[PDB]
Amino acid sequence: NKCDVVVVGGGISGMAAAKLLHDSGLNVVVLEARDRVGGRTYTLRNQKVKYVDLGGSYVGPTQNRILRLAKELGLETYKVNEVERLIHHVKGKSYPFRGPFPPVWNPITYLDHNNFWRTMDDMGREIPSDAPWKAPLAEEWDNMTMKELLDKLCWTESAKQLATLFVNLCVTAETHEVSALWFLWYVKQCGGTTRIISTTNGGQERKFVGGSGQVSERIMDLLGDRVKLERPVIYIDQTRENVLVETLNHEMYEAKYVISAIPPTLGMKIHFNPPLPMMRNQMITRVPLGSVIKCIVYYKEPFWRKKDYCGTMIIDGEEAPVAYTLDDTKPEGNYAAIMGFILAHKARKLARLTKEERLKKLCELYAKVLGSLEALEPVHYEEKNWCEEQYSGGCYTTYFPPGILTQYGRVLRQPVDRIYFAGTETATHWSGWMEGAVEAGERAAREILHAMGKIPEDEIWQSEPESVDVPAQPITTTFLERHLPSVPGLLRLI
Amino acid sequence: NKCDVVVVGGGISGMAAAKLLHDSGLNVVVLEARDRVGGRTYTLRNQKVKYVDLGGSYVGPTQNRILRLAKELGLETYKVNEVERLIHHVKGKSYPFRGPFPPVWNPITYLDHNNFWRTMDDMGREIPSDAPWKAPLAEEWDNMTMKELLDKLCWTESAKQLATLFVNLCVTAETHEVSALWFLWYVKQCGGTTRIISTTNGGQERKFVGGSGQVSERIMDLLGDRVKLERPVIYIDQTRENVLVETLNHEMYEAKYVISAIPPTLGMKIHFNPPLPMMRNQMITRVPLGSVIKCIVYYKEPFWRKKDYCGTMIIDGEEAPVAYTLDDTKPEGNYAAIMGFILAHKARKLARLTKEERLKKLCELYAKVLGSLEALEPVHYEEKNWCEEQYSGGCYTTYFPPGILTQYGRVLRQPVDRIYFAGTETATHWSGWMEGAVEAGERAAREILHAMGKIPEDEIWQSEPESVDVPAQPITTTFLERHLPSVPGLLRLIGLTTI
Numbered sequence: 004n005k006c007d008v009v010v011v012g013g014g015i016s017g018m019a020a021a022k023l024l025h026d027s028g029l030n031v032v033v034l035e036a037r038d039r040v041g042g043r044t045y046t047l048r049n050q051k052v053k054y055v056d057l058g059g060s061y062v063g064p065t066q067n068r069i070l071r072l073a074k075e076l077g078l079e080t081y082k083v084n085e086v087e088r089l090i091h092h093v094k095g096k097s098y099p100f101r102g103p104f105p106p107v108w109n110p111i112t113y114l115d116h117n118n119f120w121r122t123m124d125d126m127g128r129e130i131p132s133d134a135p136w137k138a139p140l141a142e143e144w145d146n147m148t149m150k151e152l153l154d155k156l157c158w159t160e161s162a163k164q165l166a167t168l169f170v171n172l173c174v175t176a177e178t179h180e181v182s183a184l185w186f187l188w189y190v191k192q193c194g195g196t197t198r199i200i201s202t203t204n205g206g207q208e209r210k211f212v213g214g215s216g217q218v219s220e221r222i223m224d225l226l227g228d229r230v231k232l233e234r235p236v237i238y239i240d241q242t243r244e245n246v247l248v249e250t251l252n253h254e255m256y257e258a259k260y261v262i263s264a265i266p267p268t269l270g271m272k273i274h275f276n277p278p279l280p281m282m283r284n285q286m287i288t289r290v291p292l293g294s295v296i297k298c299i300v301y302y303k304e305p306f307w308r309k310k311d312y313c314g315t316m317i318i319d320g321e322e323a324p325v326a327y328t329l330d331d332t333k334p335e336g337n338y339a340a341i342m343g344f345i346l347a348h349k350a351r352k353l354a355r356l357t358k359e360e361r362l363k364k365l366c367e368l369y370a371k372v373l374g375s376l377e378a379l380e381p382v383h384y385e386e387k388n389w390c391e392e393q394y395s396g397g398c399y400t401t402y403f404p405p406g407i408l409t410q411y412g413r414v415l416r417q418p419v420d421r422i423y424f425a426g427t428e429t430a431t432h433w434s435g436w437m438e439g440a441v442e443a444g445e446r447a448a449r450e451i452l453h454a455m456g457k458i459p460e461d462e463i464w465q466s467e468p469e470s471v472d473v474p475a476q477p478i479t480t481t482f483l484e485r486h487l488p489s490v491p492g493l494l495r496l497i
Numbered sequence: 498n499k500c501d502v503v504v505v506g507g508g509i510s511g512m513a514a515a516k517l518l519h520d521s522g523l524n525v526v527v528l529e530a531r532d533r534v535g536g537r538t539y540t541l542r543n544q545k546v547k548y549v550d551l552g553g554s555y556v557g558p559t560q561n562r563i564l565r566l567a568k569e570l571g572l573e574t575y576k577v578n579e580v581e582r583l584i585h586h587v588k589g590k591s592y593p594f595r596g597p598f599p600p601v602w603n604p605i606t607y608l609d610h611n612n613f614w615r616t617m618d619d620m621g622r623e624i625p626s627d628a629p630w631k632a633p634l635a636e637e638w639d640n641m642t643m644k645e646l647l648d649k650l651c652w653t654e655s656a657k658q659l660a661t662l663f664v665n666l667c668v669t670a671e672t673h674e675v676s677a678l679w680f681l682w683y684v685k686q687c688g689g690t691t692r693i694i695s696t697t698n699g700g701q702e703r704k705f706v707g708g709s710g711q712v713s714e715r716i717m718d719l720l721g722d723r724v725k726l727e728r729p730v731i732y733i734d735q736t737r738e739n740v741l742v743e744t745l746n747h748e749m750y751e752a753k754y755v756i757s758a759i760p761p762t763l764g765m766k767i768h769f770n771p772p773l774p775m776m777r778n779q780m781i782t783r784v785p786l787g788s789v790i791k792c793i794v795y796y797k798e799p800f801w802r803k804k805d806y807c808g809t810m811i812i813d814g815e816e817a818p819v820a821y822t823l824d825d826t827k828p829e830g831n832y833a834a835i836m837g838f839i840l841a842h843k844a845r846k847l848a849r850l851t852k853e854e855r856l857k858k859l860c861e862l863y864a865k866v867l868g869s870l871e872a873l874e875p876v877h878y879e880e881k882n883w884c885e886e887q888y889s890g891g892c893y894t895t896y897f898p899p900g901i902l903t904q905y906g907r908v909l910r911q912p913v914d915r916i917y918f919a920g921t922e923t924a925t926h927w928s929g930w931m932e933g934a935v936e937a938g939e940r941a942a943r944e945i946l947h948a949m950g951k952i953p954e955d956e957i958w959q960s961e962p963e964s965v966d967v968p969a970q971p972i973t974t975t976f977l978e979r980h981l982p983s984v985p986g987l988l989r990l991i992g993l994t995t996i
């Protein structure tokens with residue numbers, strides 16, 4: 004019933020917010036729609052897999068908030084396997100390599116690839132993390148799709164295809180679905196192209212021992228009966244002295260403030276009194292989430308390692324259901340597995356099949372790419388299609404179609420009277436990730452602490468000390484990477 | 498409590514559906530979120546204006562369903578004033594004209610304009626009204642914005658600027674916001690470029706005497722206590738024998754079937770048990786409505802008529818808050834008024850101002866365009882910003898961003914167990930309009946009648962006889978309009994003769 008703050012949503016962001024407020028001495032209640040916490044993180048446990056992350060899983064250097072929160076909760080990380088060679092599968096053929104980037108051998112193609120990645124980061128440097136709509140060319144870039152940008156930038160089909168895969172993999176959406184400004188912001192605020200795409204020294208470096216779901220679970224343990232499961236919020240009334248929050252199961256909660264810790268568009272599931280301001284009213288209809296199926300195929304042994312393959316596959320082409328895989332074997336070396344993502348339109352297309360049909364397609368693909376008949380003998384399979392989730396809307400995160408970020412972006416975390424906004428979408432560093440969830444939840448919590456006069460304004464946004472366990476190596480470039488001309492640059496020189 | 502069909506939403510579509518089912522002998526309930534019926538139609542009444550449509554207003558030839566329904570309810574239409582000259586205001590200067598389209602004199606610009614409109618309709622012919630995703634080049638066209646298409650097609654800035662205004666006016670959205678496939682479908686399913694843009698012989702020909710809100714109001718009168726106002730639906734449960742529909746004000750309704758007659762994205766405001774299928778779950782997060790403020794400035798007299806201007810202004814340029822106006826004077830010749838739309842990004846930008854500030858900007862614009870100091874002397878003002886409406890989401894209708902229509906379009910009116918889908922967005926002829934609302938409401942109703950075994954399958958979709966009161970003249974082209982080359986066409990012709 005009555006409390007200081009109601010947090011709507013028990014994902015990592017809502018839980019991080021609730022924990023901070025609880026630790027500060029406030030009475031908090033978390034209202035969670037599902038029969039579980041964790042939201043876009045979910046760790047399944049059974050005998051066949053021990054545990055498996057079916058949602059958010061990967062963490063790495065520069066994600067210091069999620070690492071600090073998890074450590075405090077008693078969790079540990081381990082390193083995703085990248086000892087052996089990676090594979091780039093191009094036009095029906097596998098090409099093993101080392102380092103974060105699949106090599107290019109044709110000279111013109113090399114220049115084009117080099118320029119593409121470089122230009123992505125160049126453009127990102129002009130985009131403020133906390134205000135992408137303030138980029139000098141914000142409107143120009145927001146009014147183009149990533150498809151249009153790639154069409155302009157890539158003078159080779161090779162570069163265009165790999166860039167397309169990159170977009171699909173990053174934001175689980177098609178290049179023609181997303182704003183160029185938004186996508187460039189997204190990459191920049193994860194620390195740039197190298198940082199986001201890398202396993203070693205990047206966002207995919209590590210996983211939590213026992214699963215990422217433990218973060219939300221362990222905070223629920225700390226908060227006790229303050230977390231209310233199967234309480235979907237349906238109504239928020241701010242017309243009176245205290246805010247009134249009503250749930251589907253006919254309960255009423257009364258609070259001084261509310262944190263909305265749900266995906267922006269899922270604010271549509273709540274009826275507001277008074278109505279939301281115009282800009283937020285329309286914003287929450289303009290911000291869909293991506294489409295992905297996360298699939299994990301289990302094997303007797305990590306057989307790929309014997310062939311000097313680490314399990315990472317970058318797989319070109321329409322026919323391939325999965326464009327990207329990582330080794331998902333346990334740190335102990337058992338429960339051997341390959342994790343793959345079915346991305347964007349392919350998640351839509353292949354959802355029509357049965358679980359068994361998808362397994363067969365994945366195994367046959369992996370057999371081809373790994374050049375191993377062993378891939379045809381799975382021992383177990385788990386998958387999760389996030390497109391079906393009423394209380395997520397998709398995964399990994401919210402994307403912005405052309406024109407939306409500039410027109411509506413400033414609304415995202417603007418308070419509405421006594422409602423403050425958390426959720427990974429509102430983060431300024433690793434938005435879209437578990438790291439962003441923690442940043443946004445803790446910032447939203449501190450906005451309320453400031454509103455209550457408990458902390459000064461300059462304490463709302465707080466820096467995070469670097470993890471001692473997961474140190475970040477700086478991202479470097481070579482002289483030639485910096486100064487080699489683009490394809491049109493070479494042509495102008497000629 | 499218990500009934501045959503619950504209709505969610507008391508706009509024209511829900512009301513049309515409810516009426517058909519009621520007339521067929523079924524027990525229906527309409528659950529309406531607002532304290533009024535009509536939804537995206539709203540007729541304000543006060544002593545200063547008598548009545549004024551602040552939402553949907555215009556009807557015209559080929560919109561036979563809304564005309565038939567309104568006539569049955571005892572309503573009449575009158576013709577929007579188009580007696581005197583129209584104005585095209587370009588680069589700070591007004592150019593009076595007659596006909597649906599502003600004349601273009603420059604031979605190159607003329608070829609470009611002619612080719613643009615022609616190509617829009619050409620492409621439209623490849624798009625099935627009931628299945629736009631089945632167009633031969635559906636994916637190619639859906640993966641481009643209208644901005645990209647205009648950039649490719651228009652070899653002159655003049656054509657590009659007018660085409661841009663056209664898109665903004667049609668779908669209250671920016672060219673870069675919307676799919677080319679979807680926009681081409683939208684225009685084609687309203688009968689093409691000429692039909693959609695025209696006053697005489699087009700969608701803007703007429704208004705209802707007394708306002709369009711009377712359609713929903715008079716159906717409510719017919720249904721009596723079956724319409725429940727201030728009942729926002731929050732929950733639909735289909736796990737049991739009968740469907741359970743719950744409202745915000747703590748009421749439960751039980752039905753054999755449900756019609757969802759709300760804008761597609763507003764389905765998000767309902768919690769579903771079991772969850773929606775994957776495609777619909779995601780579809781309803783991908784389909785925003787446009788942004789518009791409808792503004793009506795009142796004057797002592799329709800002074801523009803004295804200068805041989807009918808009141809229609811097509812106003813290009815970023816500085817103009819309103820890009821399009823029509824005379825909104827009553828058929829009696831009193832309550833003189835100009836209606837203007839503030840479109841797309843400008844609805845967002847100018848919402849920051851006060852009502853008085855917007856009135857001043859509109860009057861100053863009109864004074865310039867009409868070359869008339871009288872425009873600076875308004876006697877009254879009404880406006881409605883539809884962007885602020887929780888239970889509309891915007892106006893006029895739902896638009897599809899690039900990639901969505903091909904991936905999710907087939908889901909739009911696909912039943913979900915015992916839920917059927919009405920609403921103008923699901924229409925196949927004049928979707929986006931009051932006409933489409935009627936088509937979709939009656940089709941959804943008949944889907945349920947068929948499900949109950951009351952009518953055969955071939956009676957689900959029903960043709961409509963042409964109105965005797967509002968006959969449609971066919972859309973015609975000239976020989977030159979059909980065969981004149983595009984700009985690149987002319988250049989290729991020059992290339993070959995030079996070679």
Ligand SMILES: *[C]C1=C([C])[C]=C2C(=[C]1)N([C][C]([O])[C]([O])[C]([O])[C]OP([O])(=O)OP([O])(=O)O[C][C]1O[C](N3[C]=NC4=C3N=[C]N=C4[N])[C]([O])[C]1[O])C1=NC(=O)[N]C(=O)C1=N2C#C[C][N][C]1[C][C]C2=C1[C]=[C][C]=[C]2
Nearest residue numbers: 012014016036042043059060061236398426427435436437
């Ligand atoms: C799904 C997913 C997947 C599959 C994957 C992934 C992901 C995901 N990610 C993301 C994450 O997960 C996120 O971000 C997070 O989690 C978020 O959080 P938040 O913010 O908190 O949110 P959520 O969770 O959603 O929560 C919410 C809540 O709420 C609730 N609700 C709703 N509604 C309502 C409610 N309540 C009450 N009432 C109402 N009304 C719900 O239920 C919930 O609970 C991620 N992340 C990270 O970090 N990591 C990872 O890994 C992930 N993932 C992914 C990744 C990928 N990667 C890849 C590989 C290679 C590459 C890439 C990328 C890029 C480059 C390269």
Ligand SMILES: *[C]C1=C([C])[C]=C2C(=[C]1)N([C][C]([O])[C]([O])[C]([O])[C]OP([O])(=O)OP([O])(=O)O[C][C]1O[C](N3[C]=NC4=C3N=[C]N=C4[N])[C]([O])[C]1[O])C1=NC(=O)[N]C(=O)C1=N2C#C[C][N][C]1[C][C]C2=C1[C]=[C][C]=[C]2
Nearest residue numbers: 506508509510530536537553554555730892920921929931
């Ligand atoms: C807004 C608007 C404006 C401003 C204008 C216009 C319009 C609009 N339009 C459109 C119409 O209005 C529409 O379409 C209709 O109305 C629709 O109907 P429906 O489908 O039925 O829907 P609604 O109304 O929305 O209804 C719904 C209902 O439901 C309810 N809800 C929600 N949610 C819920 C509920 N309930 C319970 N629960 C829940 N949850 C609500 O409340 C409602 O009631 C139009 N149309 C026509 O026809 N006409 C006209 O006029 C119009 N408008 C416009 C126009 C323009 N024009 C222009 C000029 C020149 C040109 C143009 C265009 C193109 C070319 C040229």
